[PDB]
Design an enzyme around this catalytic site. Structure first.
Site, mmCIF file in Angstrom:
data_model
loop_
_atom_site.group_PDB
_atom_site.id
_atom_site.type_symbol
_atom_site.label_atom_id
_atom_site.label_comp_id
_atom_site.label_asym_id
_atom_site.label_seq_id
_atom_site.Cartn_x
_atom_site.Cartn_y
_atom_site.Cartn_z
ATOM 1 C CG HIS A 113 -3.686 0.285 5.977
ATOM 2 N ND1 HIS A 113 -4.824 0.212 5.202
ATOM 3 C CD2 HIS A 113 -3.103 -0.935 5.901
ATOM 4 C CE1 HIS A 113 -4.922 -0.996 4.677
ATOM 5 N NE2 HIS A 113 -3.893 -1.713 5.088
ATOM 6 C CG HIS A 127 -1.816 -1.207 1.315
ATOM 7 N ND1 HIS A 127 -2.540 -1.744 0.270
ATOM 8 C CD2 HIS A 127 -2.081 -1.983 2.394
ATOM 9 C CE1 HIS A 127 -3.195 -2.811 0.694
ATOM 10 N NE2 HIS A 127 -2.936 -2.975 1.980
HETATM 11 ZN ZN LIG Z 1 -2.247 -5.488 6.464
#
Ligand SMILES: [Zn+2]
EC number: 3.4.24.-
Length: 182
Positions: free
Chosen positions: A120, A81
């Site tokens: 996140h 991410h």
């Molecule tokens: Zn994760």
């Protein structure tokens, strides 16, 4: 079980993010190799913050949204991410070297598939190229204890124990990063 002085938390020294419960890379299986962290755990389109190398080693930029830092020990950390990657393939780095930011849009956040609740960092522990358990691992002064289910965040089972202060640190509270432990 990584050397207790090898790793810090994967954000800038002097700053505090909120981690969630330990889970597998996929969020389903075994072992509990990963934990997520975000400054504020906000909605998409929000401001995002700097992810840094948890340790010294070699960078692999796997994609626009994923980075691995690999130590000569075999010990490695994965960063998913990601966005705005500012390191290159073969680049040697130290703990606290800014790798980029975590993604503020789901599109980049999931460049290599998966799902996500919001912005996140998904952060994983490896050794010789395979994911390993976070049980007993140190990140700065903190020793992590792994919960009983994927994403378990009950502070009785999942916690960061500060070995220098005797303090217990829960999921979804600000976790100060002092740097590498001695
Ligand atoms: Zn994760």
């Amino acid at each position: 079980a990584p050397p207790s002085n090898l790793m810090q938390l994967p954000w800038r020294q002097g700053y505090s993010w909120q981690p969630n419960g330990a889970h597998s890379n996929t969020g389903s299986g075994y072992p509990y190799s990963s934990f997520d962290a975000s400054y504020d755990w906000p909605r998409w389109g929000s401001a995002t913050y700097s992810v840094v190398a948890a340790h010294a080693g070699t960078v692999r930029v796997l994609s626009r949204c994923q980075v691995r830092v690999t130590h000569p020990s075999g010990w490695a950390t994965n960063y998913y991410h990601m966005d705005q990657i500012q390191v290159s393939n073969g680049q040697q780095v130290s703990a606290d070297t800014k790798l980029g930011v975590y993604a503020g849009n789901i599109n980049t956040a999931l460049c290599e598939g998966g799902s996500s609740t919001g912005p996140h960092l998904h952060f994983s522990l490896l050794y010789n190229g395979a994911f390993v358990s976070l049980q007993g691992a140190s990140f700065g002064p903190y020793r992590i204890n792994v919960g009983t289910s994927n994403y378990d965040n009950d502070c009785r089972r999942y916690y960061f124990y500060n070995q220098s202060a005797g303090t217990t640190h829960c999921a979804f509270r600000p976790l100060y990063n002092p740097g590498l432990a001695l």
